[PDB]
Design a protein around this ligand. Structure first.
Ligand SMILES: C[S@+](CC[C@H](N)C(=O)[O-])C[C@H]1O[C@@H](n2cnc3c(N)ncnc32)[C@H](O)[C@@H]1O
Ligand SMILES: C[S@+](CC[C@H](N)C(=O)[O-])C[C@H]1O[C@@H](n2cnc3c(N)ncnc32)[C@H](O)[C@@H]1O
Ligand SMILES: C[S@@+](CC[C@H](N)C(=O)[O-])C[C@H]1O[C@@H](n2cnc3c(N)ncnc32)[C@H](O)[C@@H]1O
Ligand SMILES: C[S@@+](CC[C@H](N)C(=O)[O-])C[C@H]1O[C@@H](n2cnc3c(N)ncnc32)[C@H](O)[C@@H]1O
Ligand SMILES: C[S@@+](CC[C@H](N)C(=O)[O-])C[C@H]1O[C@@H](n2cnc3c(N)ncnc32)[C@H](O)[C@@H]1O
Ligand SMILES: C[S@@+](CC[C@H](N)C(=O)[O-])C[C@H]1O[C@@H](n2cnc3c(N)ncnc32)[C@H](O)[C@@H]1O
Ligand SMILES: [Mg+2]
Ligand SMILES: [Mg+2]
Ligand SMILES: [Mg+2]
Ligand SMILES: [Mg+2]
Ligand SMILES: [Mg+2]
Ligand SMILES: [Mg+2]
Lengths: 231, 232, 232, 231, 233, 230
């Protein structure tokens, strides 16, 4: 088996999964319809190992429900005119953000940037108020090609490359008082691995960004990574 | 002062709160804008009560995030034409179910039943495809006066009163194959307090209802309480 | 279809009580009672039965768990109350226990029980020395005004959880003297969770007449932050 | 340099017991006993003093914590013992408790306590009805030989924790009848930890005479897997 | 302000490593080192510094924490390896430790560190007895082809986590004899989380050659379900 | 009936030691050593043997667990002790470890083990280099008065736990120099719990001569709040 098979690097699926396309979970060790006469003997665990088993309208979502409630609250209060997502994957959170603002009556343009848009599962007929843009975050030439968009604005780092140089770029070019810059996932790990540089780098933005303590502790993905532009 | 006062029974607010109207959390022991030069010294706890801090479009929502996820998947799968909810309170979940079905392209009437609609706060401008009904759940006539409903259907007990007689009524007079009958919150408590009677009660429905294992363990509010109608 | 051959009680009747007020010794199911000592190490480690309210006193169900009993023992040994009033009797377990404890300690104490329904009380007719029963609703302050004078010190215990703050106001003005207790069992953590603004205002109204007794207030989950006494 | 003046007692003398046999009511160290109700939400939530062995019965210390008390209540109510031998006494709170408890149940029970040292016993002489104290060492089997006229049923409790297994032999042969209990408090878990193969061998020797009562044997951490009775 | 003047490193450069491969003792910031004994009760109970990776060996940082050292000690003692390979070297603390432990145990064992970048290695040149350094990328199997043929038993440790299953395939067919270990540190729990189906199949293709050693595989959180060896069933 | 004939040892003899001073590797009972990889996810995740005191060094049982070994490694690295006294020797595992660790650090350290009973000790004579054993009860001070003069710096470790505070007094008055350590293992949490009042007084009697070293005192559950110096 091993000799007649070339192996993929499982690092490619880091925090993403094996398949960008959504598939409902399969139960492997119980029936789906458990009989009520044996109700007490039914197993109490989830029944499936699916990595991040969350979806919006048939599209995988890497934002888990607690993260979703924070963004709900944030969209409701800010009524953002632009949401930029750095890192697209399957585009599920793109479609989620456009749909949420649509239901809230907020006229919001959702912009998604990725190096690799081939994984995006959103059909063409469902792309109203959603623009894609191919390009690396490993270089800032990607971001300069932006038709100057409306405010308020939420800028979400979901690609985790060159992040502080991008935050610098965002303060110098794009962000206005009240706008958010959000770093998903990485902050607690960066403080863990490099406390001193992290403390200094974040501290270099003391006069331009603050940490929003309404939302910063409300989800584990956004944990201490919700920042906004101060006056 | 206590001599002046006359004190309300706080049990009125059990599992609810004191104001059906939503208000953003209020920070008590910290500023909203933490300085980044002191990022490491910032308090790590939530900063407010975790009781029921959720909302949908300015309306309080007593369905927490993991519950919302189960209901999204369920709505996406079943594509229900009618959702009935016992217990309306502020209307948050009614507006949410209506909204979620609408953005999915599903034609879904949402129906709310409650003995007290005076706390519902969904503006009429936002009430499309929602029908409220006043009536006590303890009285079966509340349900006998309901009109024909389209299927598939999801019937959700959130009032917690007279539940097993209501489930009996729904099986004989409403639920068709594939429909859900969900009991929110109550099942772990009833089983803890009255395990033998609960088991016997639930097992009495063994030929008509099954526990849906895809959803029954995925949220603590819905825990062991997601049921659906099986073939006759 | 057993459900159609049955009527269903509201399982809310058994909230935090259980199905049967009579005590029955717990019974093992998935193991023999006598485990052979050659297989000692393979014996299951779990309780073997439900840990919901399994406590008793001389064949009467007792809804006070051991840590609560420890608190009341200490409190009785310090205060030596002449009177113990218990709102909410259920099956009489804590009544007989309060009378028995005070008798062992050489304390001449009258125990009084107040309940809307004394039909579940299982105390033998022969074991009612220094115990008095009153049928009445806590929702009417009449129940308490008609009570005849009682000796002090005195411990008043809310275990019925209805009209609690109006009763506390009544008890401060017309019953409690310096050093007497008013104890709200179980309920205080829940009211603070569900109604923090009103709960803090209501408790604050009593700031000049009652204080939290920190020696007992944190020593049991049932009495958690619920032990108060009269000031001069 | 105060260390040079003193002779230091061996703190191992106080192992699992405390400094003083006499009961001393807990002292709140960092709070007032009366907490103002207008600042109710600010009050500390922890116990407020050491939870080591703060339990008592009628002004005497009790080294049996409440969960153990409840087990022994259930066992006394079921068995209705005419005799309760306590090996190891200390202050005598357990003696007075067992005697008081049997007495309110209408059980006519004699309570016998054995100990090498009865000077720590604090039961007043007036309050010694149906209690008998005996001064011997547990290691030496002659202590037990010197009386055995006891009515049944009978509960035998080891709190001395010395020469326990030889004592259990003498018990099965020269004392216990069908239904009588033999209880090893506290030590069983620890002896399985340090000497599993030996403990298993020693215990397994009693397979034909004694069994583990599974109704009571997991109901309290002090009694954990130490409640045995004759079959 | 200060951010305007700065150019920021990608903090992923330090993922699981730290900012400095050189060892620096922890230092206290919020208490005195010498706590007075008359106030012993009041002294804080927490560690007093970051527990990320504070471990060392003879002045060199060690990314293998104590419970993992205890497992490798047992395994060295039982197996008595003549060769220990270490994919990914970093500062060389583990290399110096493996060589020292085998030396103290009386085992004649060569230690071979492989890595794309050996500049971070802090082992003094005067203390490199029975240690060999090869510089090459792990993604490319050219790095292992030119390796001299080593004595067995052998322990092969993946601490670089790149192209890991192609290297495991190559190890089985070109290097691993019966009894030898192939240890994947850190990654297995994470790979099963993100890619449960693809991971279970890949591992399972080695069911005829490799097995999981249950004496060591649950004995440390870094080695968690990743101690394999060329042994049957 | 196997019980009627047997004469049972006191199991308290094994309190905190175990039944055998010699090292025997852990053994699997409820599973195979080689789990098949096609059932990898099915394999049990628990350790599979008793976690009591499974540790060793060179075929010798070691009652110092891994977290305690890291603390002592750091302490040796920083202080560079010329002498290490261990009260309580048992199998001699900690002693051989201490000698080995000092030697590989290039430190010239004599290790001195004291114990009432040296019969359990199992170091081969071949590996006894730089280890001096002494027989004596800790329960009486004569054991320490017969000790010869020792090189500094020095680490005095108590693992016997008898007569400890008197021995600490002796050590301050007759042995310890500035910078030297006196470490009480295992016992300090327990003595505070059972006798907080006398323990506080006793430890506080030493306030002018010893201090709790906070860099090491909270780093191990065996050394927890018992790492002292000066
Ligand atoms: C899947 S996450 C995006 C999260 C997504 N918006 C969501 O929450 O559903 C990471 C994505 O960022 C992309 N990415 C990683 N590094 C990048 C880089 N250097 N430049 C552009 N995109 C990158 C990956 O292709 C991947 O699709
Ligand atoms: C807050 S929950 C409703 C949950 C709501 N759907 C949500 O998630 O936002 C409880 C509601 O049930 C109602 N209720 C309680 N008992 C009832 C009864 N017997 N009949 C009808 N409604 C009842 C209460 O008035 C209250 O509004
Ligand atoms: C928890 S039981 C009492 C516990 C009992 N004191 C003990 O410790 O074992 C609650 C009792 O309160 C009674 N009860 C509930 N509401 C009441 C009310 N409004 N007035 C009087 N009794 C009430 C119920 O009938 C029930 O017997
Ligand atoms: C744990 S205390 C007894 C506590 C009390 N019986 C209870 O359960 O609440 C242990 C007692 O056993 C006694 N003891 C300890 N070793 C003994 C021995 N070898 N022989 C006789 N008595 C002993 C001690 O004097 C001490 O008072
Ligand atoms: C976890 S550290 C090595 C652990 C070290 N042997 C120890 O335990 O003390 C990871 C090392 O692997 C190296 N590395 C990362 N990716 C690599 C690759 N693709 N090829 C070769 N080495 C790589 C890094 O440069 C780094 O030095
Ligand atoms: C836990 S072992 C210490 C071994 C070492 N920590 C390893 O690793 C404790 C030893 O102290 C000894 N011991 C107990 N009491 C003693 C006393 N009073 N005087 C001298 N030694 C004693 C015992 O014989 C036992 O072997
Ligand atoms: Mg992300
Ligand atoms: Mg509810
Ligand atoms: Mg209660
Ligand atoms: Mg004891
Ligand atoms: Mg690693
Ligand atoms: Mg030790």
């Amino acid at each position: 088996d091993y000799s007649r098979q070339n192996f993929l690097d499982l690092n490619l699926f880091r925090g993403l999964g094996e398949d960008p396309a959504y598939h409902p979970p399969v139960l492997t060790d119980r029936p789906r319809d458990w009989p009520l006469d044996r109700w007490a003997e039914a197993p109490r665990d989830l029944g499936y190992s699916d990595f991040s088993p969350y979806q919006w309208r048939g599209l995988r979502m890497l934002k888990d429900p607690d993260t979703q409630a924070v963004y709900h609250d944030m969209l409701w209060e800010l009524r953002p005119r632009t949401i930029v997502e750095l890192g697209v994957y399957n585009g599920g959170s793109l479609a989620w953000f456009r749909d949420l603002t649509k239901i809230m009556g907020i006229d919001c343009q959702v912009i998604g940037i990725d190096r690799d848009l081939s994984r995006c599962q959103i059909p063409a007929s469902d792309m109203e108020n959603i623009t894609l843009h191919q390009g690396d975050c490993s270089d800032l030439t990607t971001f300069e090609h932006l038709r100057e968009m409306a405010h308020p604005l939420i800028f979400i780092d979901d690609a985790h490359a060159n992040t502080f140089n991008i935050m610098k770029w965002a303060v110098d070019h794009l962000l206005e008082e009240g706008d958010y810059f959000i770093i998903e996932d990485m902050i607690p790990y960066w403080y863990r691995y490099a406390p001193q540089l992290f403390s200094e780098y974040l501290g270099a933005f003391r006069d331009v960004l603050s940490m929003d303590m309404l939302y910063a502790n409300a989800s584990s993905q956004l944990d201490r990574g919700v920042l906004r532009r101060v006056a």
